[PDB]
Amino acid sequence: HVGTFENITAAPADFRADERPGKINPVLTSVKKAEQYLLENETTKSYLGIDGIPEFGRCTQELLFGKGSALINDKRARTAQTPGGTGALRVAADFLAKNTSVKRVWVSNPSWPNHKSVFNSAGLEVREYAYYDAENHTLDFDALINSLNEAQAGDVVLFHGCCHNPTGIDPTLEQWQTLAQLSVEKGWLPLFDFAYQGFARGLEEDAEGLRAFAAMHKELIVASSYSKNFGLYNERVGACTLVAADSETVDRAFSQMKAAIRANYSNPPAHGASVVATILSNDALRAIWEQELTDMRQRIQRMRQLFVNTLQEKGANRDFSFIIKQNGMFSFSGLTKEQVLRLREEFGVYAVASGRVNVAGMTPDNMAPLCEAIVAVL
Amino acid sequence: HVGTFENITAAPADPILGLADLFRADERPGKINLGIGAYIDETGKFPVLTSVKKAEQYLLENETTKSYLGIDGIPEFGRCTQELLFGKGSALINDKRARTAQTPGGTGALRVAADFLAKNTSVKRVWVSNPSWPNHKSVFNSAGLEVREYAYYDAENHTLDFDALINSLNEAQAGDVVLFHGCCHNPTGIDPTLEQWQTLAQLSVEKGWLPLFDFAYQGFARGLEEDAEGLRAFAAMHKELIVASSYSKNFGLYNERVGACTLVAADSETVDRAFSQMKAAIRANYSNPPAHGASVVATILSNDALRAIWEQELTDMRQRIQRMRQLFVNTLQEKGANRDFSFIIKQNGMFSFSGLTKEQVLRLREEFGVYAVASGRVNVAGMTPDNMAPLCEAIVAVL
Ligand SMILES: *Cc1c(COP(=O)(O)O)cnc(C)c1O
Ligand SMILES: *Cc1c(COP(=O)(O)O)cnc(C)c1O
């Protein structure tokens, strides 16, 4: 008989091996405290509900919309704990494809590559809208508006809550508000990918764009992640939050969302979400975490400044000031594929061929050799 | 405009989780939960195993990072999984024909296998036993596959209709997937004998089926190595098969979502090519798997001493369920049940088809606060010497 696995096609590809001296690319204290508390107080591993820990959902909605939000008081939002932000995006995609007339999702160009594959996995067409002005390293707002002209009512338009991946360029509050007005007028269904809350300016300031939409819309979806702002990457801690016009509608929709989860992974992993709930619902433990998050934010910004300065010190004629204005861990360096290729093979400095760099991996000890490598390929 | 969510139809009730939520809300104190498969101790608790608590303490004091695992998870987790499934020194491991991905539970392993097949092969159909775990159909349909049923259970005699099983599976074509329960068939508890397994493997290789093994209860039938004999008979013959296994129950790690999806192909090149598409299907689902539960499982299986504590804990779970099965039958007789319940002794695992009708199951819940699945399936692992008497009284009252 012919083998089923014979007609399968290899998967195109998405360091670690090369032994060259000096190649260039931890758990939070609050998380360790939380885990200790769980080790000695947990008495069972019984299945969570399909939607996970209820307190995890309450604290998620408060982070997204603000304590006392009209969405919370009117009980218009339902939150399911999911395996990571990615898992939240997949659950939303399966829910939309199975239960609604949604067939088309619009994502920024450029964007996180996994957006298209997650929505495609549910049979949803993914279109791109304009976003990045590579000339000025700014948000091309005019082109963004123009390119969303063909997004029909009932289409999903995906927005990054803050720290746009990969450009690090976010709409201003006024741009957010303009987008919120336009979104209501054209009947779009907003979906926010909110994976870096707290890494731009702060917890509350980073949710301003989402809350501008939340104030205008009857319906929206938020796929949030705690992988980065809690350092809980491999524990897979995220949330998919549904918002509808009223309590009866969101509950009706949320039961089909839970049906989509049941047929995917059944119920979500507890450990990571318990940590987050333990921290968020404890005043002193939350104060510790919030300070760790502020520390992380300021360190990245500090490295952004040092990166720019050392590029100049080491003789770069190109102006990299735009790195200071960009938010989060990722910025487009502006290096060509041919310039990135050299860094990988000729300097042990590894970056994506698109020239995206990860400020997280920069330190005061590797900054000098790193910048000396970049100035060489310029 | 009109809201996108305005016309969504409410989802129907889950046959298992629908009753579970209802049990959580029940006001009566004597309520008894015989619904969802979860091991309980005689103290009325669903405890964490001691082996697990020790491993969790090790992780707490030694883990220095939470950085993403690979798409396929912890390497040592995959190797220990293949040892349990196929046995240390198997030809599949030495020939490097097997690739394992850590998944969120055995359910997640089923969906990953289903997505992988739906998106990378010509598979359109999955054959599932009648009866079977209710969520099998939901998992396969959501990935785009049809679900067909093949004969299995003799209700009147409480046995496995092996002849009806083979005849029904003649409608299955080459390239179609056939799902087999490794051990402790859900919900009947009736597993094929080794000779019956070897006949299915023989017949499977001939018809060209793609065996899919759901292996959620390894160790609860007779023993770790013994419970894998059916699978290993298929492995010795087939060039290709898939195994979705779970550690939720044999490690008591239900809510950490610890499972594995293992691909087996003819040679190392074919499995690696197929496995790259499995990882792609995983990337577009949950990206990478949760570490805590799998780290616990890997830590236990890799330490000889810690493994011994666990394998003794598992052994204590298996034979305590065996003691409840015997007590269940003996108490039914003492409480006035006239019919023969001896078939319950022959059944393996946590679950047993009690023969109760849908209406009788409804009565138990409303009038007696005893919660079973509408199929008549009962969770023997939820019975205790203390709740056995009231639950048997309730059952006899509705007979
Ligand atoms: C990292 C990232 C995600 C996924 O986060 P996880 O919780 O690890 O799944 C989603 N969207 C963006 C933009 C990201 O950068
Ligand atoms: C319980 C069960 C599962 C689910 O295993 P999880 O690890 O909880 O996802 C899968 N298959 C069968 C037959 C089961 O009984």
Identity of the residue numbered B96: K
Say which residues have a Cβ less than 8 Å from residue A265's Cβ, sequence separation at least 6: A83, A87, B103, B104, B105, B107, B108, B111, B257, B286
Task: Quote the CA–CA distance of B319 and A93 in Å, as a whole number.
Answer: 44
Residue located via tokens 């190797």? B79
Instruction: Return d(Cα B33, Cα B31) in angstroms, integer.
Output: 7
Q: How far, rounded to the nearest angstrom, does the alpha carbon of residue B345 sit from its chain's CA centroid?
A: 20
H runs (alpha helix) in chain B: 17-25, 50-62, 75-86, 91-94, 105-120, 135-142, 162-168, 194-207, 224-227, 229-237, 268-283, 291-302, 304-334, 343-346, 358-368, 388-398
Render the burial of A108-117: b for 16+ CB within 10 Å, e for the rest: bebbbebbbb
What is the architecture, at CATH level 2, of domain A30-283?
A: 3-Layer(aba) Sandwich (3.40)
Q: What is the resolution of this structure in A?
A: 2.2
Work out whether strand A189-194 and strand A156-160 pair parallel, antiparallel, or are unpaired.
parallel
Q: Is residue A369 reached through a cis peptide bond, with omega within 30 degrees of 0 on the bond before it?
A: no
Residue type (1 letter), B345? I
The alpha-helical segments, DSSP class H, found in B36-104 are: 50-62, 75-86, 91-94
CA-based torsion, A112, A117, A119, A120: positive or negative: positive
| Tally of residues, chain B | 399
What's the burial of A11, exposed, middle or buried (CB within 10 Å: 0-12/13-18/19+)?
middle
Ligand 1 touching residue A86 (CB < 6 A)? yes
Q: Catalytic residue numbers of B?
A: 133, 214, 249
Nearest residue (CA) to ligand 1, atom 1 = A195
Q: In this structure, what token pair is assigned to residue A207? A: 């949710």
Q: How far apart are CA A234 and CA B290, in angstroms?
A: 6
User: Cβ-count burial of A350 within 10 angstroms (0-12 exposed, 13-18 middle, 19+ buried)?
Assistant: middle
Residues linked to residue B262 through DSSP beta bridges, in sequence order: B100, B243
Residues A108, A158 contacting (CB under 8 angstroms): yes
Q: Is A84 on the interface with B (CB under 8 A)?
A: yes
* DSSP letters spanning A295-335: HHHHHHHHHHHHHHHHHHHTT--S--THHHH--SSEEE---
Q: Is B46 left (phi over 0), alpha (psi -120 to 50) or beta?
A: beta
Instruction: Judge whether A136 and A84 are in contact, CB under 8 Å.
Output: no
Check CB contact under 8 Å for A154 and B46: no
Assigned CATH for B55-305: 3.40.640.10
Cβ-based neighbours of B152, under 8 Å, separated by 6 or more:
B129, B130, B131, B132, B160, B161, B164, B165, B185, B188
Torsions phi, psi of A190, nearest 5? Answer: -70, 135
Tokens 């499977």 correspond to B204
CA distance A360 to B342: 65
Distance CA B179, CA B136 (A): 9
B186 is in an annotated binding site: yes
Q: Do A268 and B291 lie within an 8 Å CB cutoff?
A: no
Q: How far does CA A182 lie from the centroid of its chain?
A: 23
Ligand 2 centroid vs A161 CA: distance in angstroms? 36
Q: Which A positions 208-237 lie with beta carbon below 8 A of chain B?
A: 218-219, 231-236
What's the rounded Cα separation, in Å, for the pair B73 and B296? 13
Contact present, B374 and B361 (Cβ < 8 Å): yes
| Chain A residues in contact with B280 (beta carbon < 8 A) | 11, 117
CA A221 distance to own-chain centroid: 14
Q: Does B56 touch chain A (CB under 8 A)?
A: yes
Sequence-distant (6+) residues with CB within 8 A of A103 are A97, A124, A125, A155
Task: Fill in the DSSP letter of residue A48.
Answer: P
Q: Which residues of A touch B239 (CB under 8 A)?
A: 3
Question: What is the Cα–Cα distance from A27 to B64, expressed in whole angstroms?
Answer: 6
A6: three-class secondary structure by DSSP: coil
Cα(A234) to ligand 1 centroid in Å equals 12
Q: Mapping DSSP to helix (H, G, I), strand (E, B) and coil, where does residue B317 land? A: helix
Q: Please, is A41 exposed, middle or buried when counting C-beta atoms within 10 Å of its C-beta (0-12, 13-18, 19+)?
A: exposed
Q: How was it solved?
A: X-ray
Quote the CA–CA distance of A95 and A277 in Å, as a whole number: 25
Q: In this structure, what DSSP letter does residue A43 have?
A: -
The A residues from 144 to 203 touching B (CB cutoff 8 Å) are 153-154, 187, 189
Q: Any CB–CB contact under 8 A between A37 and chain B?
A: no
Closest CA to B193 of B155, B222, B158, B151: B222
| Cβ A118 vs Cβ A264: under 8 Å | no
In angstroms, rounded to a whole number, what is the distance separating the alpha carbons of residues A299 and B209?
57
Cα Rg for chain B, rounded, in angstroms? 21
Q: How far is CA A194 from CA A49, A88, A281, B382, B384, in A?
A: 23, 11, 21, 41, 47
Interface contact B1, partner A, CB < 8 A: yes
Whether the Cβ atoms of residue A108 and residue A163 lie closer than 8 Å to each other: no
Q: How far A135 CA sits from the closest chain B CA (Å)?
A: 32
Cis peptide before A166 (omega within 30 of 0): yes
Q: Specify the 3-state DSSP secondary structure of B356.
A: coil
Contacts of B220 (CB under 8 A, 6+ apart): B183, B184, B227, B249, B250, B314, B317, B318, B321, B348, B349, B350
Q: What are the tokens at B90?
A: 């198997």
Using a 10 angstrom Cβ sphere, with 0-12 exposed, 13-18 middle and 19 or more buried, the burial of residue A67 is exposed
Smallest Cβ–Cβ distance between A35 and the set B60, B108, B120 belongs to: B60
- Token pair of B204 as six digits: 């499977």
Q: Which residue has the tokens 């019975």?
A: B383
| Bridge partners for A220 per DSSP | A243
Give the span between the Cα atoms of B50 and A156, in whole angstroms. 48
Cα–Cα distance between A378 and A343 in angstroms, integer? 11
Rounded Cα gap, residues B321 and B380, in angstroms: 6
Put simply, the answer to whether B6 touches A187 (Cβ < 8 Å) is no
Copy the structure tokens of residue A106. 């619009």
Which strand (E) or helix (H) includes residue B159?
A: strand B159-160
Structure token digits, residue B312: 């003794």
Contacts of A291 (CB under 8 A, 6+ apart): none
Pocket of ligand 2 contains residue B37 by CB under 6 Å: yes
Any bridge partners for residue A239, and if so which?
Answer: A81, A224
Residues of chain A neighbouring B43 (CB-CB closer than 8 A): none
Give the single-character DSSP code of B189: -
Do residues B254 and A44 touch, judged by C-beta distance below 8 A?
no
In chain A, which residue ranges form alpha helices assigned H by DSSP? 29-41, 54-65, 70-73, 84-99, 114-120, 141-147, 173-186, 203-206, 208-216, 247-262, 270-280, 283-313, 322-325, 337-347, 367-376
* Nearest-angstrom CA–CA distance, A86 and B285: 7
Instruction: Give the residue among B396, B376, B372, B373 at the shortest CA–CA distance from B31.
Output: B372
* Residue among B202, B197, B192, B183 nearest B152 (CA): B192
Q: What is the C-alpha separation between A164 and A329, in angstroms, rounded?
A: 9
Distance CA B2, CA A176 (A): 23
Ligand 2: which atom is nearest the Cα of residue B105?
7
Compute the count of residue pairs across chains A and B with CB atoms less than 8 Å apart: 238
Query: Which H, E and C letters describe B247-276, residue by residue?
Result: CCCCCCCHHHCCEEEEEECCCHHHHHHHHH
DSSP A144: H
Among positive and negative, which fits the CA dihedral A117, A118, A122, A128?
negative
To the nearest 10°, the Cα dihedral for A370, A374, A375, A376? 100
> Residue type at B374?
A
How far apart are alpha carbons B53 and B253 in whole angstroms? 11
Q: State the Cα–Cα distance between residues A211 and A205, nearest whole angstrom.
A: 10
Strands B241-246, B351-353: pairing kind: unpaired
The secondary structure element, H or E, covering residue B129 is strand B125-129
> Would you list which residues of A are annotated within the binding site for L-aspartate?
112, 165, 356
> Who's near A271: CB < 8 A, 6+ residues apart?
A35, A38, A235, B256, B290, B292, B293
Closest by Cα among A181, A189, A182 to A155: A189
Q: Please tell me the distance from the alpha carbon of residue A50 to that of residue A267, in angstroms, as a whole number.
A: 5
Residue B20's identity, in one-letter code, is A
Residue B187 Cβ contacting ligand 2 at under 6 Å: no
Residues in CB range of B23: below 8 A, 6 or more apart: B31, B33, B35, B371
Q: Which residues of B154-192 are buried (b: 16+ CB within 10 A; e: fewer)?
A: eeeebebbbeebeebbeebeebbbbbbbbbbbbbbbbbb
Q: Rounded distance, CA B241 to CA A5, Å?
A: 10
CB of B321 within 8 Å of a chain A CB? The answer is no
Cβ of residue A213 lying under 6 Å from some atom of ligand 1: no
User: Who's near B183: CB < 8 A, 6+ residues apart?
Assistant: B191, B215, B217, B218, B220, B221, B222, B227, B228, B230, B348, B349
Distance of CA B93 to the CA centre of its chain: 24
Dig out the tokens for A174 from the structure. Answer: 């006024």
Contact check, Cβ <8 Å, A236/B287: yes
C-alpha dihedral sign at A271, A272, A278, A284: positive
Radius of gyration, alpha carbons of chain A: 22
